[PDB]
Enzyme design. Structure first.
Site, PDB file in Angstrom:
ATOM      1  CD  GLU A   1      -3.611  -5.544   1.113  1.00 50.34           C
ATOM      2  OE1 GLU A   1      -3.535  -5.565   0.295  1.00 50.34           O
ATOM      3  OE2 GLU A   1      -4.401  -5.300   2.107  1.00 50.34           O
TER       4      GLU A   1
ATOM      5  CG  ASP B   1      -2.312  -3.476  -3.078  1.00 53.96           C
ATOM      6  OD1 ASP B   1      -2.191  -3.501  -1.998  1.00 53.96           O
ATOM      7  OD2 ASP B   1      -2.844  -3.088  -3.913  1.00 53.96           O
TER       8      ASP B   1
ATOM      9  CE1 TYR C   1      -2.458   8.814   2.720  1.00 55.26           C
ATOM     10  CE2 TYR C   1      -1.605   8.477   0.210  1.00 55.26           C
ATOM     11  CZ  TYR C   1      -2.726   9.180   1.335  1.00 55.26           C
ATOM     12  OH  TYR C   1      -3.453  10.296   0.871  1.00 55.26           O
TER      13      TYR C   1
HETATM   14  O1  LIG Z   1      -2.906  -0.004  -3.091  1.00 49.23           O
HETATM   15  C1  LIG Z   1      -4.173  -0.216  -1.833  1.00 49.23           C
HETATM   16  C2  LIG Z   1      -3.447  -0.065  -0.415  1.00 49.23           C
HETATM   17  N1  LIG Z   1      -3.932  -1.694  -0.594  1.00 49.23           N
HETATM   18  C3  LIG Z   1      -3.349  -2.216   0.554  1.00 49.23           C
HETATM   19  C4  LIG Z   1      -2.232  -1.761   0.537  1.00 49.23           C
HETATM   20  O2  LIG Z   1      -1.720  -1.860   1.833  1.00 49.23           O
HETATM   21  C5  LIG Z   1      -2.009   0.127   1.577  1.00 49.23           C
HETATM   22  O3  LIG Z   1      -1.325   0.837   1.944  1.00 49.23           O
HETATM   23  C6  LIG Z   1      -2.612   0.586   0.068  1.00 49.23           C
HETATM   24  O4  LIG Z   1      -3.184   1.827   0.188  1.00 49.23           O
HETATM   25  C7  LIG Z   1      -2.515   2.654   0.699  1.00 49.23           C
HETATM   26  O5  LIG Z   1      -2.063   3.443  -1.029  1.00 49.23           O
HETATM   27  C8  LIG Z   1      -3.086   3.806  -1.158  1.00 49.23           C
HETATM   28  C9  LIG Z   1      -2.626   4.292  -3.202  1.00 49.23           C
HETATM   29  O6  LIG Z   1      -1.935   5.340  -2.694  1.00 49.23           O
HETATM   30  C10 LIG Z   1      -4.381   5.516  -0.253  1.00 49.23           C
HETATM   31  O7  LIG Z   1      -4.799   5.689  -0.963  1.00 49.23           O
HETATM   32  C11 LIG Z   1      -4.083   4.285   1.001  1.00 49.23           C
HETATM   33  O8  LIG Z   1      -4.479   5.501   1.800  1.00 49.23           O
HETATM   34  C12 LIG Z   1      -3.074   3.814   2.058  1.00 49.23           C
HETATM   35  O9  LIG Z   1      -3.113   2.939   2.982  1.00 49.23           O
END
Ligand SMILES: OC[C@H]1NC[C@H](O)[C@@H](O)[C@@H]1O[C@H]1O[C@H](CO)[C@@H](O)[C@H](O)[C@H]1O
Ligand SMILES: [Ca+2]
Ligand code: NA
EC number: 3.2.1.41
Length: 708
Positions: free
Chosen positions: A372, A343, A556
């Site tokens: 990512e 991530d 999420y």
């Molecule tokens: O971990 C942070 C983000 N990294 C990319 C992932 O694919 C995302 O899904 C992730 O974000 C999601 O999780 C966060 C933390 O709980 C939330 O705040 C975001 O809005 C959500 O998209």
């Protein structure tokens, strides 16, 4: 102090955590806490985790650590430590906190809605467990069908709960819904689809959740304040979450169940990839309580830097680096997994990620990694460091990255989500489209096609179906629009599945999965303060709202009614022929890709020899920016494939002339109805013309010209 001087003076390389030995009789405890004045372990009852059973002091050891052995001599009244629970009591300058062991192998059932009652409830309690003894004893690394190296992988992105939370399948589950062992029961679907790797959304312990309600169906539409969690709020990096467990109060049960799920994936010729979230924790104190101003990246004055409400793990720092590496190694060795997805991998320094790759590969020589690769590095203040992002791809052939250029160019992407693009009526630079399809994106240098993870949808953002409906502005509730979106969906999926690189499929992207907020009180626009959180309201060409206008783009924190994988739409050809047509198209596409290595070449030099653009921009009725494309691959066995795409809304002709006249007695491997590695007896949507070849509106084809 400074993390840099603390490393010099307290760098520790021995074992960490709690080793349950002697078949339960003994526990060896080690915890790195250089600054501590005292450290005790508080032990909690296995039958009532609120019940403190005793408190044992630890003694100072080598390089900043604190060590203790729980055995026969305990005043605790314990002869088998198995399943008992513990936290660390740490005193510094007269103040005491309770901490989670960062190397905890499992945890007591966790519920963050009880976090305010007292200190003991603020972080999880760890469990004394022994992974090796649990689950299928024959579990080992995958032997993956149709897969040799990264370019060979077809990746499928699924959340453990979503994959079985459809009440529509409750009738067919023998295991509790949305758990690891329920997942096992729908694995035959994925083996039939033909994906090689199932990438699971985060299974390691996360913070914001009430695991004690994990069997309750979240049947009400909601997109904020839900017990559902994607899991991107990490609490611990060795322990599995209890949310996907048949019993979160049994600390051993989640281990056996996960080990059994990885084993079942394996026996079906597939691998497992683990979404891991090392860039941030859910809470600054998770590690600040362990050793102040060390673990995180910080400002100059030692203030921890923050991301998503928690702390940023500074993987440049000795103990934080080894946390990342030990976790990788432990997960590979214990659960025998086949890869990791990082991530926000751009938050990390290259060196950490590289070493994680090498250690994982030392255990499982066939493991793959992607992440990512967004350019997000923050790091320590005043300490620039080379990051594990897209710009790193030119210095490594190890961990691949997501391609936002193909995503953006085909349907939309940040920062222009919802704007017409290649498959959504918005014309694009044909050279750019082609460079993406051969796994040379224009926004970073990919010097090997395996550097590139090719995708057009994932768990983030609007699903492929939803994004297309927003982009062309056609309400899917009209049979004719439904059909058009699917025509476009198939087009996109064809483009990805025939592209070089490693294709990535969001679970449900094969059938046309939606996150439309279909709440009965939301058939029409509602007042401002009631608008679903993380929604977009969808409108037609005249600006009139869709029937059920709100669709979730960040789910999420949405419920099962939003997040469930729809099994009827995916499998019932009678009730949903368009969706099943789509699913069967994906299946054939993956079969097509797997029948030849023309679509998955292994080097940059070999791609430039074998793939040549046919639709030269500017020439033959093909604008410099357009909605069509055609090209050719000469496969290693001398067969010649051609891919032609017409994402226009009218028939469009591809000029062949004398240079590509050999494409005429092609067999047709895909058309408007179906796809596969075998010739379609009666191909549809194709017409042979004097100039070359005519394709119907919103139609793609694959050809193979043999001499055999
Ligand atoms: O971990 C942070 C983000 N990294 C990319 C992932 O694919 C995302 O899904 C992730 O974000 C999601 O999780 C966060 C933390 O709980 C939330 O705040 C975001 O809005 C959500 O998209
Ligand atoms: Ca490379
Ligand atoms: Na979107």
């Amino acid at each position: 102090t400074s993390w840099r001087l603390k490393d010099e003076t307290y760098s520790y390389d021995g074992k960490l955590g709690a080793d349950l030995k002697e078949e339960g009789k003994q526990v060896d405890l080690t915890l790195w806490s250089p600054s501590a004045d005292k450290v005790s372990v508080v032990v909690y009852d296995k039958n009532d985790p609120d019940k403190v059973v005793g408190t044992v002091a630890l003694e100072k050891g080598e390089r900043g650590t604190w060590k203790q052995t729980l055995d026969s001599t305990n005043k605790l009244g314990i002869t088998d430590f198995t399943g008992y629970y513990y936290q660390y009591q740490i005193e510094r300058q007269g103040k005491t906190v309770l901490a989670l062991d960062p190397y905890a192998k499992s945890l007591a059932a966790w519920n963050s809605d009880d976090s305010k009652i007292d200190d003991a409830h603020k972080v999880a309690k760890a469990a004394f467990v022994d992974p090796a003894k649990l689950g299928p004893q024959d579990l080992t690394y995958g032997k993956i069908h149709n897969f040799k190296t990264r370019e060979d992988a077809v990746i499928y992105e699924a959340h453990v709960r979503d994959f079985t939370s459809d009440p529509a399948i409750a009738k067919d589950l023998t295991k509790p819904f949305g758990t690891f062992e329920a997942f096992i029961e729908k694995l035959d679907y994925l083996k039939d689809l033909g994906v090689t790797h199932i990438q699971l959304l985060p299974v390691l312990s996360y913070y914001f959740v009430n695991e004690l309600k994990n069997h309750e169906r979240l049947s009400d539409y909601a997109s904020s304040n839900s017990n559902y969690n994607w899991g991107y709020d990490p609490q611990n990096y060795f322990s599995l979450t209890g949310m996907y467990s048949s019993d979160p109060k049994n600390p051993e049960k989640r281990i056996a169940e996960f080990k059994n799920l990885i084993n079942e994936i394996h026996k079906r010729g597939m691998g497992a990839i683990l979404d891991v979230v090392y860039n941030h924790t859910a809470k600054v104190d998770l590690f600040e309580d362990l050793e102040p101003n060390y673990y995180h990246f910080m400002d100059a004055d030692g203030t921890p830097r923050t991301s998503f409400g928690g702390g940023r793990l500074g993987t440049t720092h000795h103990m934080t680096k080894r946390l990342l590496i030990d976790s990788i190694k432990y997960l590979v060795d214990t659960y025998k997994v086949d890869g990791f997805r990082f991530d926000m991998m751009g938050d990390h320094d290259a060196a950490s990620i590289e070493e994680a790759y090498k250690a994982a590969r030392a255990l499982n020589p066939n493991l793959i990694m992607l992440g990512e690769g967004w350019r997000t590095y923050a790091g320590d203040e005043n300490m620039p460091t080379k990051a594990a992002d897209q710009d790193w791809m030119k210095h490594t052939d190890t961990v691949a990255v997501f391609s936002d250029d193909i995503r953006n160019n085909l349907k939309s992407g940040y920062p222009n989500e919802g704007q017409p693009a290649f498959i959504t009526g918005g014309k694009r630079d044909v050279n750019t489209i082609f460079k993406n399809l051969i796994a040379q994106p224009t926004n970073f240098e990919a010097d090997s096609p395996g550097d590139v993870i090719q995708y057009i949808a994932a768990h983030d953002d609007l699903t492929l179906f939803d994004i297309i409906a927003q982009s062309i502005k056609k309400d899917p509730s009209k049979a004719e629009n439904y059909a058009e979106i699917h025509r476009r969906l198939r087009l996109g999926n064809l483009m990805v599945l025939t592209a070089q690189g490693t294709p990535f499929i969001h679970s449900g992207q094969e059938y046309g999965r939606t996150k439309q907020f279909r709440n009965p009180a939301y058939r029409t626009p509602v007042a401002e303060d009631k608008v679903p959180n993380k929604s977009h309201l969808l409108r037609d060409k005249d600006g009139n709202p869709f029937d059920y206008p709100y669709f979730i783009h960040d789910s999420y924190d949405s419920s099962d009614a939003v997040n469930k994988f729809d099994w009827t739409k995916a499998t019932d050809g009678k009730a949903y022929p368009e969706n099943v047509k789509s699913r069967d198209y994906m299946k054939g596409l993956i079969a097509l890709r797997q029948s030849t290595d023309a679509f998955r070449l292994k080097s940059l030099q070999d791609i430039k020899d074998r793939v040549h653009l046919i639709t030269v921009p500017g020439q033959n009725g093909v604008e410099k920016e357009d909605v069509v494309i055609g090209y050719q691959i000469t496969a290693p066995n001398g067969d010649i494939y051609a891919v032609f795409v017409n994402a226009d809304e009218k028939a469009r002709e591809f000029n062949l002339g004398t240079a590509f006249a050999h494409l005429r007695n092609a067999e047709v491997l895909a058309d408007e109805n179906q796809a596969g590695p075998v010739g379609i007896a009666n191909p549809k949507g194709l017409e042979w013309t004097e100039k070359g070849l005519k394709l119907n509106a919103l139609t793609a084809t694959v050809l193979r010209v043999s001499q055999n």
